[PDB]
Design a protein around this nucleic acid. Structure first.
Lengths: 330, 129, 129, 129, 129, 129, 129, 129, 119
RNA sequence: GGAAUUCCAUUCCCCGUUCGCGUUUACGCGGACGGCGCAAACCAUUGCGCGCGACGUAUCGUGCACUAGGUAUAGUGUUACAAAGUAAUCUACUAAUAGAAUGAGGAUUACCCAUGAAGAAGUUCAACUCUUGACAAAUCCUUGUCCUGCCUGUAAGGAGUGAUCAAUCGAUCAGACGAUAUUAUAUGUCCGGUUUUAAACCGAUUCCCUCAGGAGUGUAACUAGCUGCUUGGCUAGUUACC
């Protein structure tokens, strides 16, 4: 969008408008309490710069534009390249995140930061390398132990890992009770434009901007919000054997597979703008111009749906799957 | 037309079939995923490559999860969680006719037909004796 | 309810009126601008702050551009050649009645009524003699 | 031309007008004042200077006292809690002709026309909400 | 659904009521003010900000002037002797539901209902005896 | 006669009202708690001091918990999952009449009356806008 | 209107007057000189400044020479033999009414009216005895 | 009365006159500017200062520009192509009477009267030939 | 003709019999696994090694759990050293000793079946 | 004491003329002229002195005398007694003796031994590689206190002026460039002399043999969020610190 003026000016050359704009076409959109719907809108300017006399209003016949400057014929090689390149960014996972997901990924990057901390320390207890099991609990390696069995040495460090047991519930419960019960929007943009030449010489530049908003709608993310976890404070750790750390992370292992799997989505709505910026040449010479715009509310979204590569797939959560599927299960 | 489409994976007699849906095609590795439900999802991948100067390889990976929950103390805690995998490669020479590629597919389809020993061994937790 | 609405800045008798529209509200400083070009645009900002313990300091800015036609390589882009900056700062004590605040507005309105010596001198590029 | 004359600053519709009058011209500052004491009168000043190689600044200042429960001619302390202050700086470049200096005055009149959101916030002790 | 509206602060049963009006939104603080000068009006400020990742903190301030021997519109010194101050701060955890926040609102209304010992002690300039 | 008596804090229409009771008066800090255990009771305080030479400053705090039952070591003990905190400080000048103290109490009752923008914003968890 | 005009300083019954005429205004100082050369002229100045924050101060200087004709190197040049310098300073506060400034001017005229002791002492080279 | 007034600088018939008008009197420099764009305006200055013990010295400066139009980047602007600079300084001793000052002004007006050789050289781009 | 075949382990009437089936024969070590979930399955191994110049030394192992995971598990571990001089009329005599040892009524299988020692 | 005596005594025991100076000018200061045997006795006393081996050419190999001279001249030899008093746990062998948690790990079997994988990688696909003075006392009138008759390998070898050559009556030896340019221009790389006369100079495979052999090659904030604007729809946006 280059600049254009709407104040209709008129010149007079000896041996006729210089520019023209229709009415400001203002429409409003609906508004619900969760999301604000978009609205159609269109402005442009026919303008004749240099020169027998022409009318700047009647120069719509050169350009592929209607009289109201609203409807613009976009080429099918521009419309079809714009629709597929948006819709492949939806599935491939190249998009932007709402505030509700940037706070949901952050509190789901705190499970994976701390379930690396236990599992790298718990499997350091099976193997017997207690010099590595004291780094991961932020303890001092200078401690020598009093008991000699493997399960007795683990209960001596119980002041070390019970903070990690409760801080995982600090990240597990914020997902299933708060974050996974929210509205979770996403945004994907791709612009496509070419250059056309006609003979009335005139060269335009018709480009399309497709912005599609869509939110998470999945059945198995309402299933992960149904589940719970055991309270590590309310479990007497002395009576229950040493392999209960594995039986405590079973609801966590459902999350890190349940989040990182690709997610189904439904869309709210989106906008499609069209921008033509061009010139024309009419020894009698002339130069007319357009820079126009028109938003659309039409939805480019398949009824087969899209299964988006999940935003929860992260550097941290793919390392927390790489421990449980190798050490605790294999 | 495109082959990257929807198909049925588990044929549970009509009632309870698991169809599989196309999601992603990143980095040359195709990827399918099961339908919308209240469970963990399946995965089916397919990636084709030219390994050597005279071979073509097809990699298929299938994952099957099961999750079982009990109601203990007024919550739904997950009790058991595991997955079983599938991993096959298929090295085909580049001198293979299209009618010779119909023979390789029937060689794999006849291997797992119901009644043959290899699906008889898996479905009974037994070996070949 | 809101007083941060759209109003008209230059009243040319019904035809060619310059309207100005609410755009941005950062840092407690309200801002009106004209059509969304942001370079050839009129701009009106208002801010309110408690300067001293007994005073209140309003700040009003107006930028009036002079629109023009730039021609680079046969491509016509409108651009502002120069801008004019009105920048007033009104200090009212907190002991002023609302009927005394109506006296301050009438003082600024009557100062600029067409015919008084100050808007006469500005309109002729002159001073007070 | 003689612009330094008498005019009406606050227009109360025939009766109750406060007609401001010329009083001083020292150091090129044209000063208007009403027929009151110096602590309770309206004071208007106007000066013209060239600020840089490109621009000219007009400095207009208006002082309006608080009128509610006024003691006319009495001694009133403190001084800063009885009087308002106006401060205007109009930076106009040297490229502007007479018709462009008419457009700037129409902008300042349209900024302070009644019903607009800027002077309706001043007379109501409010901001932009 | 905008709560930034006009409401009646002090009720005197139909006639003699005091209606407070919204004025300003500087720096995330929403301000109400009644129809008087800035030093003799009822002012309410309500700002909402989240203090940690676990708590939302409401900050409510009310200013009420002393009424007896008031000079209507006059200048009254010192400022800190003529105006009362209220300062409420409320902390609500993020685990609360909408039904939980309805009971917190009812918790403040029963504390200040006329007849209870807290507002019947403030109204007599006494303590809890 | 004494104002250190019993009142109702949360009035849910006769049935299920949380009534609060006098329990402590040590260190000049009044204290009201409900008929619960010390972990699951509401707590309401009151304190008056002469802060400056010309001000009286109250401090009223209200603690509203959410009841639960926690299993610690295999034994269920009544405890509150989270508490919410009210914290106000009412500064009244010493020159205020008994009638001007009633205006402050009416100002706090009208601030939390049902339907006003501030208590409606707290219950629906929305901001003031 | 303007008050920087011509007046008569010494009134010798019509014939033999000294009229004094405005000549300069630079640096905010008025200057009247008589119709002579620049050496044998009478000279009256006047200047007004805001001296303190609550005062306004006037400065009036009057020069009355005795004319002569000095032979400088054989050439006769009009020159003054001695000058008499009147120099007064009037401090009027900002709290003064225009009916209080007219009481000052009646005091400066009755001080110098003929028949009073102070102008009788100057016109006889005597003191107050 | 005052001589800091609007006077005609160029008597060009009755139509093409450029009547210049007062603009500023800062630092004792009486500066006249014509009424159009500031880059295409004339200029006349005057200042009187006591240069030595027996001399007064005037300093007159006159700028006369050529009216053209700068077009840089397609945007046209009213500028001056070049300027003519008159810079004349007159020294008058203080012994000169008003009859002597009239004979100095008659020397200037006869110096520039048309027909004399000096103004007939400037109006032909010539020297004394 | 092969004896790496399916045999009945627990003769429990004729209905609740646990019939165990061959699973794996890696490294000369036989393995039988019953046809259920792997964690709830019986496990029988067998291996013959020439221990020295005049011995063959068998190894039989039976794991019996409690019945989807096993709560606990039993472990039999029995060896049988037979010299190379023993004929087939003597090898059948050795198996008659093991069958006569664990016959229902003898003191050793009546002590295992009642959580008792030898008294 | 004694002796003999020759016995009263011993012996012996200014002036003047006259030129220059200066305002202390009818005064100063100068200059030039003028004025035992012998002996003797005095006599009974003295002195004196085959079978082994080999070859042949009966041949080789190994286990006073005396000798000469002759003119008679030369040489040379409590137990005991004498006795109431001394002296003092399992083992073996046997009628005796010695010796004390795991492992498809092993045993002479209730003993010993030892320790405390993935890969949308590849093929030579059931096998690998790659990558992570008071006073007292008794005994009492008294104290004590104050050339050849040379030989042979016989045309060879060993052993005792002139004379070539000269040709003269002579010499001898006894600017380029398939470089560049903005193009007669910068550039890149490698007074007489005379005559040349519009110019200048002088003043495994081959070989071989005696032949089955040899040679050789993320964290806490801060703004905003009003059914209104829209020159590319909002559902956020930039700043700090790790």
């Amino acid at each position: 969008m280059r600049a254009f003026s709407t104040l209709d000016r008129e010149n007079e050359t000896f041996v006729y408008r210089s520019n023209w704009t229709p009415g400001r076409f203002n429409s409003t959109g609906a508004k619900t309490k969760q999301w604000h719907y978009p609205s159609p809108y269109s402005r442009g300017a026919l303008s004749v710069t240099s020169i027998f006399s022409l009318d700047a209003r009647s120069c719509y016949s050169l350009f592929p534009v209607s009289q109201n400057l609203t409807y613009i014929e976009v080429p099918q090689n521009v419309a079809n390249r714009a629709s597929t390149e948006v819709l492949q960014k939806v599935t491939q996972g190249n998009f932007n995140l709402g505030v509700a997901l940037a706070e949901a990924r952050s509190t789901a990057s705190q499970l994976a930061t701390q379930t690396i901390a236990l599992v790298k320390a718990y499997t350091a207890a099976r193997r017997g390398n207690w010099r590595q099991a004291l780094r991961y609990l932020a303890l001092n390696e200078d401690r020598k132990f009093r008991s000699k069995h493997v399960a007795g040495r683990w209960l001596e460090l119980q002041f070390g890992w019970l903070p990690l047991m409760s801080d995982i519930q600090g990240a597990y419960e914020m997902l299933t009770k708060v974050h996974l019960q929210e509205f979770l929007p996403m945004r994907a943009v791709r612009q496509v434009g070419t250059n056309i030449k006609l003979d009335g010489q005139t060269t335009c530049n018709i480009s399309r901007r497709i912005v599609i908003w869509f939110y998470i709608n999945d059945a198995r993310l309402a299933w992960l919000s149904s589940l719970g976890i055991l309270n590590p404070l309310g479990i007497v750790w002395e009576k229950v054997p040493f392999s209960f750390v594995v039986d405590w992370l079973l609801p966590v292992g459902n999350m890190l597979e349940g989040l990182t799997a690709p997610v189904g989505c439904s869309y709210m709505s989106g906008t499609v703008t069209d921008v033509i910026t061009g010139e024309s040449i009419i020894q009698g010479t002339a130069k007319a111009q357009i820079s126009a715009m028109h938003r659309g509310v039409q939805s480019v979204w398949p009824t087969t749906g899209a299964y988006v590569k999940s935003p929860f797939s992260m550097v941290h959560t793919l390392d927390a799957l790489a421990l449980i599927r190798q050490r605790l299960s294999r | 037309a495109s082959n990257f489409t929807q198909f049925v994976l588990v044929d549970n007699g009509g009632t309870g079939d698991v169809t599989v849906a196309p999601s992603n095609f990143a980095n040359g590795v195709a990827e399918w995923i099961s339908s919308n439900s209240r469970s963990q999802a399946y995965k089916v991948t397919c990636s084709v490559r030219q390994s050597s100067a005279q071979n073509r390889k097809y990699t298929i990976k299938v994952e099957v999860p099961k999750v079982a929950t009990q109601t203990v103390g007024g919550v739904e805690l997950p009790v058991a969680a595991w997955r079983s995998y599938l991993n096959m490669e298929l090295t085909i020479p580049i001198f293979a006719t299209n009618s010779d590629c119909e023979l390789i597919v029937k060689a794999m389809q006849g291997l797992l037909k119901d009644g043959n020993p290899i699906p008889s061994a898996i479905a009974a937790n037994s070996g070949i004796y």
